[PDB]
Amino acid sequence: KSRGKRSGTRYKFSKKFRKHGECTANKYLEKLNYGDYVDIVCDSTQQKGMPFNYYHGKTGKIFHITKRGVGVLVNKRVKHRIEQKKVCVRIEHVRKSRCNEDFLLRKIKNAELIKEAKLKNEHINIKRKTEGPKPAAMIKVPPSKIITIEPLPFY
Amino acid sequence: KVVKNKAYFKRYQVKYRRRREGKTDYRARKALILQDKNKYNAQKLRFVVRKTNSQVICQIACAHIEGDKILAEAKSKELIRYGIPVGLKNYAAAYATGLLCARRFLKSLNLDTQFLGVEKVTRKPIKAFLDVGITRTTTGNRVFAALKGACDGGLNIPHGNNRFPGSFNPEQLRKNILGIHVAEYMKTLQEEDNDKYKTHFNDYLKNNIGADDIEQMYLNAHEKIRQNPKKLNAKLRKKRVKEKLALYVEKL
């Protein structure tokens, strides 16, 4: 019977303990470019440009930049299909997404590895390792370090 | 009842350090530095002028994530080498140091020959925005003297004319820029009682700066600057409380 804009956001749109107050001045210096990924976290201290309840915590790539706002394209699940949604928010409600940072660092490091590998004419595996079973080990331990364990009685 | 209980301390949230110290506003700052997100690599330089109770300082600041970068600066105490040995807190001193900051910035950027500013006192130039710094912007405030100094030095600092002395009086502005108000204060004090005048403008006299000499020395300064710009750790802490209680056993 109640489906207002901010219905059910009692805790989601509340500031953290001892973290109240307006956004820091340094946040306005954040650099944003077209097509890069961005997180949508609602800052309750800034009311205009607030994202809708659903998009809090979502991620999407920027498709529009204005003087003080960002239009970001976000996937929303609607029954039987995902669909693209253009949400327009202010700067305070958006932050640079780290969802790509491991990929970017991997790209740089792998490039500077591939360069040297091709220079030395070596074949290397550039794909991630998904490490599984460990090899056999031949381990040593002082006899005074082995301790005998047996189940404890009840009390 | 005590309101300073540990629950109060535990729930207490501090302000930012600079707000706590009173240095910065953080509401003026975040509108001074916030630039249109459409425009990339546009720095929006701010002309920061801060007046101490001994001298005033001007600088050019560019906002950056790790901290502000200072591109140019000027202190009132540098006017000694330019010929002003006294009154470094003056309206005229503020104008002079704004001129100095502007000229030094243009020199560092290598654009003096292209932006001459003006002479004497009444492509697009560099744009900077005046930073207040807590002070109240009343009519005839020294921050606007510094702004006029920079504007005459060649910077494009947007401003109105309300807060120059007189809500517009260019003659009054030139008088205050040249220190005429100080000169007439000297005259009035001399004519009304010599003792207070001597005890007030003491090192003025020790520098033999006459009332009529002030305007000329400020003009000469303007042209000259224009043409050339211990801790304790837990171990000994416990040792010291142990000995303190050992002595307190019989002390009281």
Added chain:
Amino acid sequence: AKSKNHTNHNQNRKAHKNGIKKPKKHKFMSRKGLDPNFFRNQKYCLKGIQKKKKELKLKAKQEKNN
């Protein structure tokens, strides 16, 4: 009589029967209402680029066809 007001039962099965369709994700998005004074300038850039390129190509065609 009383009606079953609501249920989400079987809706997830219906949704997954034809899969959860993803958006097509085309390469170009229409710029109809985005950043004027920027996309207008982009139009001018592109017009100039075509003018120069086509005039170079026309010069080459004329000098090769006599």
Added chain:
Amino acid sequence: VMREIKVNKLVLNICVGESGDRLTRAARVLEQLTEQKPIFGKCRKISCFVTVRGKKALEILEKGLKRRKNFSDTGNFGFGIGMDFYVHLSRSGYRVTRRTRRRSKISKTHKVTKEDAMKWFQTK
């Protein structure tokens, strides 16, 4: 040292609690008493008062000279006669707590306290 207590402020109060005529009379008597124009109380207009500083504060305190149990714990006092005297005395450096730039608090060593306020009063 510069730990000399001086009269930071001296406030005269007329609390009549009614409308004008008598309020105007109080305003004018305060007016010749001190040339500063008085201000009025609340308008829930019930009282008029004036705060003075400088040499005039000492002069009016001398006039009011004509107890030792009515000193506040923060180093202030006051009395009456109709008109009411109150005096807020403080050490030097009190500007720190009132200025806008780097407003702070003075240490309680620098605060006056009542004990030496009594000594100051009996010395004056």
Added chain:
RNA sequence: UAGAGGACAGGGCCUUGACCUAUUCUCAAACUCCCAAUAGGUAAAAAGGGCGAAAUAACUCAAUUUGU
């Protein structure tokens, strides 16, 4: 829910408390300092990325050579 220690009010040095301090028993779907499990989202390179030069623009910039 209980006591423990400690300088405003009533009567006859005392009584009745209030109040303060440090504790104590027990609780909240419409309480929260903290905070899971499960559930959820984004990313994991070729119509692309990186690095440079040269062109274009009426955009942007102090900048026909700043940037985009």
Added chain:
RNA sequence: GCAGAUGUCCAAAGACAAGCUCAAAGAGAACAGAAAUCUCUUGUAGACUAAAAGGGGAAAAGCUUGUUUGAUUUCUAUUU
């Protein structure tokens, strides 16, 4: 199902800027008292913000003051 609220109110209770800091408590001051005004100290909001409740707010989004009518015309991309 549960505790409620709406069919309004506002030329300011809208806009901008500046200055200030609130509730409360303690101590002190002729009338003057539990309460009336003034001063100091503490005071993270315990006040206030038209209304229900929930969020937000301290050199403010609160209080005061100044100037105003952006509560204007037209059109997009969109969210619920």
Added chain:
RNA sequence: GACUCGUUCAUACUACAGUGGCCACACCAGAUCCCAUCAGAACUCUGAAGUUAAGCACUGUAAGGCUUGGCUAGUACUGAGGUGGGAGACCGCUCGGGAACACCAGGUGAUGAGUCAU
């Protein structure tokens, strides 16, 4: 040694106490002018006689708070399986995940750009 603009926004706060000053901050002297009030208190302007008393800086406290680790504790809770136990309430087992309060201990900052003084 110090200052300006910042970052982090309590390891940075609060209370009490001690130490420190040449320019440096500041307290401080004054009100003709710009300006401001009941009030030159504040704000603004002009100063340079005095002072580290305060602000400020540093340190201290079997200090409160804050913060890191340990421990609470594989406890509480919980995903999947069970023709598991039990009359039930509830409670194991198998494959997995895994807290919190409290208590203990350590700590009480670090840093970007620029500038001044020696």
